[PDB]
Every structure is written in structure tokens, then in C-alpha cells.
């Protein structure tokens, strides 16, 4: 979204965009190439946009578009949760065997060059513990919500 | 027969500003306007609205003013600029609702047969309440009871289409309740998911305090509809016992040996890779 | 009568209260299951009747009082061990 | 010869029929990783031994 | 036909033969009853097969409303012997049209099945989620509706 304003031709011997004592002109956009090919900057000029943004409209649009009350202690119970506990471990086994491969390799093939010529978003740390995080977050939030429902409901 | 209503977030939004329009002369504490809609199925859709002049008197609470002629012409405008949209009902605020709403609804059911009303809550916006919507049916009341109106409820939600999430996501920009949550995000969902559990319960606390204490006349419908709740909660038993530790342990095993060990060895790999690269730059400075 | 703490009713209690004979209680309880005022089940190795029950009625304001006390014990167990969770994980909640 | 899932009793002369648990897979896939992780610690054991 | 709907319409074949056996003998019009049953071998097998249909109707309602049942009670409720009730049930389970299992050293048979910890916990959460959180959501909104009508 952008806003504009038509400039005169009477100031052809003077500075079009007659701007002055401020340093917030170089912000918000440099004049883009797809827009200065047209009447920028000799027919019209750009003008800055910020938003009259306030509380009681910010919070009612935050809290009402993304909210879940009774969902916060549901279970998604175990037939697909414990199934997903198989779904990650299996390739994590094979990716651990791939983690075995690079570490027992450990050759002086100029190892700062050996690490940089095989960046692949791959085994040793990238395709590692990322899975360990997902196994951790899924099982704790499952089991902690399970113990609370025993506590709360009788 | 309405499944649920879908609140497009321009309508509420276009109520709050109109409450703020009259707020410079604000002495009415209610704003009534017209709710445009788009009826598709048993699920309802709302995406546009406007307001209408309305007044109400605290004395006798039955002298009230919807403006028909203003409702005719301005809806004729919004029909002309967009023939997709039509009326579906009306709105107001002030959650302690005036009992005049029988008269407001039964007037403008001659515009839409299955008319519907949505209460927004401009100032109470804190714990668990986005909006609320009612539906109008009229039985007598029950089998051996006198006549009544009895507004009934249809559940509500806040909807989302494309090119308003574009307007949403560009306007949050601060915390946003970021995408799929971390450990801290899920625990807070368990916290304020449970902070509303007793909040609904403190309301049903006070109801059977003030009805059983002896003030207001008892409903009979809500009593036994509350009764089956207490005869439906689970208890602890041996079958709950041996099963819970059968699958808590099974959830536990995945955490224990597969996540704690492997994360340690990766950090143990960062030991040797640091200490080799530390001292081999140290001993080769000079 | 008993609020599902031991809802496993023995067959002799039906034969005492309804003063019906022993052989008729099964047709008696399959009838009430057929009509739909109860959704329990029947064991016969112990001849005891399990009860999961969904047909409620009026509960006579002096027993709203006991219904209040159930709700308050239910209320304070929710509130107390919510505070235990918030105080325990306050540092990582934020 | 695993043609049948049961058991016998001499003290009773009584044949008993039961079933099998198929949920071995999670613990089975767990302890195979320990065989992998045992070798990577051995890989880091002589890596620290070859150079400190 | 109303009595052979469901939920036992509480019945017994000894009662059935002694109130409708007059319908199988002479009456006002009556003639398809004498046409179907009452013959020499064609109706007589159909006497047996009606007995077969009513005892099969009594098995399915037992699987609805019984965790367990002793063997002697099933024999006296089907108007037939203990050994016939063994073989008639053994026929239905190798046909796997009624899903049951017996234990004939003690005679206590069962109809329910061994549930799983994935299943019992799924029933624990189902009563928890669907009808303790939603009905608690439900009671609150009628509780707000009573404040509309009662005050003022």
C-alpha cells in the first residue's frame, strides 16, 4: 500500500519534493525502481504511512482471533500420540548411524575445509537434536496435562 | 436451525469505533445497529454491518427506537455497491442485556425470518469472552407452564479468510502469540486454560448460592441438567491405576534414554571440538 | 442413593427393596435399560449390577445444600493446585 | 513350533488360550540406538586420547 | 412382528408356543398359518427354524446387556439343554456372528472383550473431554440466561 500526492510544474527551477528540517525521509522506502519508472519523482511524490494503533482494539483483535480455552487441557489422547513416538525414533536411529559415520571418520582433510565443503542442512547437529526437541516438547506437555486431570477431576 | 455463526473481524471492530463515535456524548451505554450477513448453510456467516439511531429509557424499559427509514436506505446503498450481502440480524453491547430485546427482535424479524443477534462485549474483554450470540424460538415454556419468549443460544466463533489475515498479521507486530508453541507456550495454555475453569465454576458457584439460598425462583431445567455432570466424572480404580503407569512409563522411556542421552553426547561433542580448536590456536600463536 | 462411590449394586438389594424374587431382577433391569432411564450393565459371576446413570430429576432444595458443598470442595481443589503449578514454573512461564 | 498361542497345565489338565503383545517396537528401536551411541563415545574416547 | 423387534420384548419360547399355537390351529380365516407351518415335513422344519430364529434373537440381546452369565442360567433361559447351548453358541462363534467366548471348566462365560490401555485411557479422556468440559460450558450459558428472566 502506498500514498502519493501530485506535484506542480511551477517549481521546475526549484526543488520538487520541497522537504526540510527532518531526518525521517530516508526511512519507510527508498524510491523503488518499479515506481520511479513512472511519474516519480517529477509528477508526484511519495508520502509516509504509519498507523493510528491503540489499545482496546489491539488486544481485542489479538485475543479474539487466536484463542482456545478448553483446548488448553485436552489430550489428543494416545492412539496417535504414542504412535508418533514411534514415528520419529525410527529415522532418528538411522540418522544416529549417520552421526556415527562423520565422527569416527575424523580425518585431517584440512578439517575447516572438510566441514565447509559438505554443508547440506544435514546430519551432525542440524538433523540431530531438532528431533530431540520435538520428542521432548510433545511428551512432556502430554504427560503433564495427564497428571493434572487426575489432580483436578477428583 | 443454526450450527454456529462465523464472526468476520470487521464487524465487532466496526462496533467498537461506533461506540467510540457516540462516546463523546456517551450516556446510552448500549449501541444497536444492523448486522449484515451471508447465509450459506446451517453454519452462518457475517462479514459486514452498520449502525442505526437507537435510544432507550431506564424507566418502563419498553420505549425504544429502531429507525426503519434509515434502515431502508442505507441497506439499499450496501446492496447497490455489493449485491452479495444481505441482512441477517442486529447487535448490541452491555452484557447485562435489557429485557426489551424481545421487542427489538420481533420487530425486525419482518426483514429476516430466522433473525439472529450477536452481543459483543466492548469493555469486558479480559478473561474468556469473545462475543455471544442468541437465537429466537418461542415455545409456551414447558409442559405445564405459562407462555414465555426464551431466547436460546447458538455457539459462536471468530472466522478468518484471506485478505483479512493480511490485515491482521500486519497489525499485530508485537508478540503475536507466535507459531507452533514451545514448552513455555503450552504451559501457559494450561495455566489460563485452567484459570477459566474455576472462573466458569465461580459463576456456577454463585448461581446455586443465590437460588438455593432462597432469593430468585428456581428453574427446574438447569437443575437436573447440572445433576448428570456430577454423576459423570471419573474416579480412581485399579483399572485406572495399572493402566496409567503402563503408559506414563511408555511416554517416559522416549524422554529418558533417547532424548537426554543424545542431547548430552552432542554437547559432549562440542567439548572436544572446542578444546582442540582452543589450544591448537593457543600453542600456535608464537 | 449412593453417589457412584460403590454403584455396583448387589442383586439382593433389589430383591429386598422392590420385594421381587431373585429370578426376575434381570428382566427387571433389562426393561429399564430398554426404556432408557439407565445405561448400566449386568455381571453374573458376582450377580452384581453396574450402574452408569443418566436420568436426572428434582433434587429438593435441602439437597442443593449438599450439592453446594460438593461444588466448593471441587472449587478449592482447582484453585489450590493451580497455584502450585504457577509458583513452581514461574521462572520459565513468563 | 509356534503354530498356536496357548499353554498347558499338568496340575489341572487344563488348556489356556491367550494372545500376544505387538507393542515391542518402541523399546526395540530404543536399544538399537544405544549400540550406535556406544560406538560414538568410543569414537570420542580415542579422539581425546589421540590428542588432548 | 412387534414382539420380535429388539430389547427382548420380554419373551420366552415356551410362552410363545402357548399363546400363538392357537393361531397355528383352526380359527376364523387363519389359512397362511396352516399353509406355512403345520405340514408334514415342510412346516415341521419351519417349526424348528422359528425356534432357531427366536433363540438367535435371545443371544444378541444377551451380548448387549451382560458382562458375564453362568452356563446354567443360559440353559434355563433358552428352553434347552446345557450341551445344546454349548454347540449352538459354538456354531455362532466359529461363524463369528456373535462375538463371545466361554470357559467351561467353571461354566462362567463372558461377552465383553479385553480392553487395551490405549483404549481404557481413551475412554477415560472421552468422558473427561466431551461431557465434563462441554456440559460445563453449557450450564454456564443457561445460568446467564436465568439472570435475564429473573432480574428484574
Number of strands of chain B: 9
The residue fraction in helices of chain B comes out at: 40-55%
Taking the alpha carbons of the first and last residues of chain A, their distance comes to 56 Å
> In percent, how helical is the residue content of chain A?
40-55%
Q: Briefly note the structural class of the backbone of chain A.
A: mainly alpha
Order of helices and strands of chain A: EHEHHHH
Shape of chain A: flat
Q: Which overall shape of chain B is indicated by the principal axes computed on the Cα atoms?
A: extended
Helix and strand pattern of chain B: EHEEEHEHEEEEHHHHH
Number of strands of chain A: 2
Determine the strand fraction of chain B and express it as a percent band. 5-15%
The strand line-up of the biggest sheet of chain B is 4-2-5-6-7-8
Structural class of chain B: alpha/beta
Count, helices of chain A: 5
In what order do the strands lie side by side in the largest sheet of chain A?
A: 1-2
Computed over alpha carbons, the radius of gyration of chain A is: 30 Å
Work out the strand percent of chain A. Answer: 5-15%
Major beta-sheet overview of chain A: 2 strands, antiparallel
Please state the oligomeric state of the protein chains shown: part of a larger assembly
Q: Greatest contact pair?
A: A-B, 48 and 46 residues
3D architecture notes:
The structure is cut from a larger assembly and holds chains A (about 150 residues), B (about 290 residues), C (about 90 residues), D (about 50 residues) and E (about 150 residues). By secondary structure, chain B is of the alpha/beta class. Chain B has helices spanning about 15-20, 70-80, 100-105, 165-170, 185-195, 195-210, 220-230, 240-280; strands at about 5, 35, 45, 50, 85-90, 115-120, 130-135, 150-155, 155-160. With about 50 residues, chain D is mainly α. With about 150 residues, chain E is mainly alpha-helical. Chains A and B meet through helix 2, helix 3 and helix 5 of A and helix 4, helix 5 and helix 8 of B. The PDB classes it as hydrolase.
Amino acid at each position: 500500500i502506498d500514498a502519493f500526492r501530485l506535484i506542480n510544474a511551477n517549481m521546475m527551477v526549484l526543488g520538487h519534493e520541497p522537504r526540510q528540517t527532518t531526518s525521517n525521509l530516508g526511512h519507510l522506502n527508498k524510491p523503488s525502481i518499479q515506481a520511479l519508472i513512472h511519474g516519480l519523482n517529477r509528477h508526484y511524490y511519495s508520502i509516509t504511512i504509519n498507523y493510528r494503533k491503540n489499545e482496546l482494539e489491539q488486544k481485542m483483535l489479538l485475543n479474539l482471533h487466536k484463542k482456545s480455552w478448553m483446548e488448553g487441557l485436552t489430550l489428543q489422547d494416545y492412539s496417535e500420540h504414542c504412535k508418533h513416538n514411534e514415528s520419529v525414533v525410527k529415522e532418528m536411529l538411522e540418522l544416529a548411524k549417520n552421526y556415527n559415520k562423520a565422527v569416527e571418520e575424523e580425518d585431517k582433510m584440512t578439517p575447516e575445509q572438510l566441514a565447509i565443503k559438505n554443508v547440506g542442512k544435514q546430519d551432525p547437529k542440524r538433523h540431530l537434536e531438532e528431533h530431540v526437541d520435538v520428542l521432548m516438547t510433545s511428551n512432556i506437555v502430554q504427560c503433564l496435562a495427564a497428571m493434572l486431570d487426575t489432580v483436578v477431576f477428583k | 436451525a443454526v450450527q454456529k455463526v462465523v464472526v468476520h473481524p470487521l464487524v465487532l471492530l466496526s462496533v467498537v469505533d461506533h461506540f467510540n463515535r457516540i462516546g463523546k456524548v456517551g450516556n446510552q451505554k448500549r449501541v444497536v445497529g444492523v448486522l449484515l450477513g451471508s447465509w450459506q448453510k446451517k453454519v452462518l456467516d457475517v462479514s459486514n454491518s452498520f449502525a442505526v439511531p437507537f435510544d432507550e429509557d431506564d424507566k418502563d424499559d419498553s420505549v425504544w427506537f429502531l429507525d426503519h427509514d434509515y434502515l431502508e436506505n442505507m441497506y439499499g446503498m450496501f446492496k447497490k455497491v455489493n449485491a452479495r450481502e444481505r441482512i441477517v440480524g442486529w447487535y448490541h453491547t452491555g452484557p447485562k442485556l435489557h429485557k426489551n430485546d424481545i421487542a427489538i427482535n420481533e420487530l425486525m424479524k419482518r426483514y429476516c425470518p430466522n433473525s439472529v443477534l450477536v452481543i459483543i462485549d466492548v469493555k469486558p474483554k479480559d478473561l474468556g469472552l469473545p462475543t455471544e450470540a442468541y437465537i429466537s424460538v418461542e415455545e409456551v415454556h414447558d409442559d405445564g407452564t405459562p407462555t414465555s419468549k426464551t431466547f436460546e443460544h447458538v455457539t459462536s466463533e471468530i472466522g478468518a479468510e484471506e485478505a483479512e489475515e493480511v490485515g491482521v498479521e500486519h497489525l499485530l507486530r508485537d508478540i503475536k502469540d507466535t507459531t507452533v508453541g514451545t514448552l513455555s507456550q503450552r504451559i501457559t495454555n494450561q495455566v489460563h486454560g485452567l484459570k477459566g475453569l474455576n472462573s466458569k465454576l465461580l459463576d456456577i458457584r454463585s448461581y446455586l448460592e443465590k437460588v438455593a439460598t432462597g432469593k430468585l425462583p428456581i428453574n427446574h431445567q438447569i437443575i437436573y441438567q447440572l445433576q448428570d455432570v456430577f454423576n459423570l466424572l471419573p474416579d480412581v480404580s485399579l483399572q485406572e491405576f495399572v493402566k496409567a503407569f503402563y503408559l506414563k512409563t511408555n511416554d517416559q522411556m522416549v524422554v529418558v534414554y533417547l532424548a537426554s542421552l543424545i542431547r548430552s553426547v552432542v554437547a559432549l561433542h562440542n567439548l572436544i571440538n572446542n578444546k582442540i580448536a582452543n589450544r591448537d590456536a593457543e600453542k600456535k600463536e608464537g | 442413593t449412593r453417589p457412584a462411590n460403590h454403584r455396583q449394586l448387589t442383586f439382593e438389594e433389589i430383591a429386598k427393596s422392590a420385594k421381587i424374587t431373585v429370578n426376575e431382577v434381570e428382566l427387571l433391569v433389562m426393561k429399564a435399560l430398554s426404556v432408557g432411564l439407565v445405561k448400566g450393565s449386568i455381571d453374573e459371576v458376582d450377580k452384581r449390577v453396574h450402574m452408569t446413570w443418566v436420568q436426572p430429576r428434582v433434587l429438593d432444595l435441602q439437597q442443593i445444600k449438599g450439592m453446594k458443598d460438593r461444588l466448593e470442595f471441587w472449587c478449592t481443589d482447582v484453585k489450590s493446585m493451580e497455584m502450585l503449578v504457577e509458583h513452581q514454573a514461574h521462572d520459565i512461564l513468563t | 513350533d509356534k503354530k498356536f498361542h496357548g499353554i498347558l497345565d499338568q496340575g489341572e489338565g487344563v488348556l489356556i488360550i491367550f494372545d500376544e503383545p505387538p507393542v515391542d517396537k518402541t523399546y526395540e528401536a530404543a536399544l538399537e540406538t544405544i549400540q550406535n551411541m556406544s560406538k560414538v563415545v568410543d569414537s570420542l574416547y580415542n579422539k581425546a586420547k589421540k590428542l588432548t | 412382528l412387534l414382539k420380535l423387534f429388539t430389547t427382548m420384548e420380554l419373551m420366552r419360547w415356551s410362552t410363545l408356543v402357548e399363546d400363538y399355537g392357537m393361531e397355528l390351529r383352526k380359527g376364523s380365516l387363519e389359512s397362511p398359518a396352516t399353509d406355512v407351518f403345520g405340514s408334514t415335513e415342510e412346516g415341521e422344519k419351519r417349526w424348528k427354524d422359528l425356534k432357531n430364529r427366536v433363540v438367535e434373537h435371545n443371544i444378541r440381546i444377551m451380548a448387549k446387556y451382560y458382562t458375564r452369565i453362568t452356563m446354567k442360567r443360559m440353559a434355563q433361559l433358552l428352553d434347552l439343554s446345557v450341551d445344546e447351548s454349548e454347540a449352538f453358541l459354538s456354531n455362532l462363534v466359529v461363524n463369528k456372528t456373535i462375538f463371545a467366548k466361554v470357559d467351561r471348566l467353571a461354566g462362567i462365560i463372558n461377552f465383553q472383550r479385553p480392553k487395551d490401555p490405549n483404549n481404557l485411557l481413551n475412554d477415560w479422556s472421552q468422558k473427561l473431554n466431551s461431557l465434563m468440559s462441554l456440559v460445563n460450558k453449557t450450564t454456564h450459558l443457561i445460568a446467564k440466561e436465568e439472570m435475564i428472566h429473573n432480574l428484574q
